[PDB]
Design a protein around this ligand. Sequence first.
Ligand SMILES: CCCCCCCCCCCCC(=O)CC(=O)N[C@H]1[C@@H](OP(=O)(O)O)O[C@H](CO)[C@@H](O)[C@@H]1O
Ligand SMILES: CCCCCCCCCCCC[N+](C)(C)[O-]
Ligand SMILES: CCCCCCCCCCCC[N+](C)(C)[O-]
Ligand SMILES: CCCCCCCCCCCC[N+](C)(C)[O-]
Ligand SMILES: CCCCCCCCCCCC[N+](C)(C)[O-]
Ligand SMILES: CCCCCCCCCCCC[N+](C)(C)[O-]
Ligand SMILES: CCCCCCCCCCCC[N+](C)(C)[O-]
Ligand SMILES: CCCCCCCCCCCC[N+](C)(C)[O-]
Lengths: 116, 576
Amino acid sequence: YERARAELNQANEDVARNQERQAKAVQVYNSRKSELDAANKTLADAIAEIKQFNRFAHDPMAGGHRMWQMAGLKAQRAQTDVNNKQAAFDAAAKEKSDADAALSSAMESRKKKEDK
Amino acid sequence: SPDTLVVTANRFEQPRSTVLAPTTVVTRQDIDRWQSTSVNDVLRRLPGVDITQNGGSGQLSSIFIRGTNASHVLVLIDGVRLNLAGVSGSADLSQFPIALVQRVEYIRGPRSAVYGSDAIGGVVNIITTRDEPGTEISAGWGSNSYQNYDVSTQQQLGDKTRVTLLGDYAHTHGDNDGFLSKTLYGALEHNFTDAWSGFVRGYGYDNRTNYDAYYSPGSPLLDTRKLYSQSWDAGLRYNGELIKSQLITSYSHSKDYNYDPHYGRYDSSATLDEMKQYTVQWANNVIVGHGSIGAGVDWQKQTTTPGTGYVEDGYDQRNTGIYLTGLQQVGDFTFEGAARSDDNSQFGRHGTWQTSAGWEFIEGYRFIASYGTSYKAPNLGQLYGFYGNPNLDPEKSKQWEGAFEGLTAGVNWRISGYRNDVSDLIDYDDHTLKYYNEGKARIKGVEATANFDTGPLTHTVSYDYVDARNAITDTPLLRRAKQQVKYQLDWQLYDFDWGITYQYLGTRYDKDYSSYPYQTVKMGGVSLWDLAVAYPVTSHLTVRGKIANLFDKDYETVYGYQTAGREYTLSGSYTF
Ligand SMILES: CCCCCCCCCCCCC(=O)CC(=O)N[C@H]1[C@@H](OP(=O)(O)O)O[C@H](CO)[C@@H](O)[C@@H]1O
Ligand SMILES: CCCCCCCCCCCC[N+](C)(C)[O-]
Ligand SMILES: CCCCCCCCCCCC[N+](C)(C)[O-]
Ligand SMILES: CCCCCCCCCCCC[N+](C)(C)[O-]
Ligand SMILES: CCCCCCCCCCCC[N+](C)(C)[O-]
Ligand SMILES: CCCCCCCCCCCC[N+](C)(C)[O-]
Ligand SMILES: CCCCCCCCCCCC[N+](C)(C)[O-]
Ligand SMILES: CCCCCCCCCCCC[N+](C)(C)[O-]
């Protein structure tokens, strides 16, 4: 029987590492969605701004026309910030899913090994 | 000014007769008599040139040659693409200093066959060398606080070695103290042998100019611009009886700040366009029969700085071109052609070509017919901006021209009609926020030039009708002038040199910037006299006076933007 109480003693130790490895992946996940929903709004800001001085776009002497180029530059800087921040939230949502399923089947194993 | 020499057609020296496309030439002497105080003020005088500007000197401006877009004229400085056109893709000469301009060769019609991109309407080569021994001190005071101070000398340093220097200072109001040009220039030119020779040069200007900006509460107001441009070049030339070759490298570096005086210059509010153009050219030419054959290469590199031209990152555009030129006079027929292949970093290759024959059917009278294709590459923002599309094609142009020139009764003249069907025009799309190639224009235009003597009295008349149109909506391109009439009048009487220069600008349609949704309003077609005189007070010292806009008869070229009224310029120059 004591060949098996080490297989619960180490199984409990496996859900311990997977719980910390889930809590670390939830802080990383919430951080990312945060920086992203922020940067996605500095983007949509830029794009409405574009549509504001979009009326000047085909008329380079206009001077509101410059407001439209400035708008796009800040949108393109914003767009590369949305792409950086989305890649990282995709990197964090892959490691929340992987850690949720790793924990969840470490618990299934733990429940089989609790069977005395 | 015919049967005097040009270099702009085929790169090498050739009599203007032999050039079939119509060419105007302006000299330093001409510029001095016009007392012109900017490059725009010179081009504006010449057939088929229609210029728009957001005010006066220093302000943003666009040349439309024979109906074509602003971006369709190729402006060269000493046969190299004007560095201040890199970022924007279109040519603005308002910042370029008149002090430097020493000759203008301007050949209408296409010439991408020789020069590469942007040569669709025509080509304006501003030349910053001339051969006039001596040294000259000049100045002038004028309306709107215009002051000018200029020194300029050419000397034999070695009698096989020439040096040339100019310094110019130029200030005028409009802004606050808004347009300051400071130019320095230096060139060294040596003859290794009667036919081998080489040169070096440097010039630069620093310009400050103030303007009307769009105001946004909470955010800096960018209404000051500091441009620093400089340009170096070096070359060998071979001038043989039969073969000719020239090998010319150039480097141009320009920084363009647009900032708010209160906030800095080096402050995130400021925009900064820093551009470096590198160019290497190898032209060659042999005389063959009664004519020549030419073959050259021009390489061009343009690098920009993160943020330049409203693009996040810095790019490195490159273009290698190789071309061929041909000339043969046989009997009374005459035949030019050219052909070029460009290789562009972004869009790979595009060949271009032109041909033209003339025929002296009677002596003194000539019929010329011409055909050619020409293109404009896409530009930085177009390809790499937020609105960008990095797989755009060149805008393409097919061109057609008929002409009769004659010399009768002491009167030199031309009547010409031209067709110009541009295609692939690169156009913004509000819906998708992007650029694309669909877009087209039909341009049918006429050009009449003449000029002649009566009494001690000399005229340079001309007339243009151009009708530019979208070839889909069949409606006018905004902002062109249906017609202009350009007239000049020259007498030196009792040693007083005079000039009455007159232009009726035609009718133009712009957008009314004042009530969204903006409509169109017709702009009055107006008439524009200028009067100019000059007197030798001494064989070294000329005093020049002028009044532009004689009749205070004010109006605009861009709707909503004031145009200087009657303005007086008292100037003087001292040669030795
Ligand atoms: C050759 C044909 C006949 C003679 C023509 C030559 C006449 C030379 C006149 C020189 C004096 C010009 C002077 O009257 C104007 C002055 O220099 N400018 C001032 C002043 O006039 P503007 O409104 O600028 O024309 O007013 C403003 C502000 O009050 C200033 O910007 C400027 O200093
Ligand atoms: C005052 C001496 C004049 C001789 C030198 C003129 C040619 C050199 C031009 C350099 C101008 C560019 N910059 C701003 C770096 O000077
Ligand atoms: C009036 C004196 C002028 C001195 C010129 C100094 C040498 C300049 C060399 C420029 C060469 C052009 N470059 C860098 C593209 O090779
Ligand atoms: C009577 C002398 C004529 C005025 C001389 C003006 C010289 C100033 C040129 C400075 C140009 C400086 N920079 C940076 C463009 O080289
Ligand atoms: C590669 C085809 C074009 C070759 C053209 C080269 C022309 C250089 C002109 C220098 C002529 C030399 N020279 C005097 C010895 O004849
Ligand atoms: C205009 C630049 C031409 C560069 C190519 C020159 C190559 C030909 C030189 C060989 C002839 C030398 N030399 C002095 C005898 O004529
Ligand atoms: C005398 C001029 C003859 C050409 C001399 C130099 C040849 C280099 C041409 C490279 C052009 C290649 N390409 C296809 C990219 O255009
Ligand atoms: C762009 C091509 C325009 C045609 C240029 C004409 C070149 C042909 C010259 C061949 C004459 C030869 N040769 C010695 C018989 O006179």
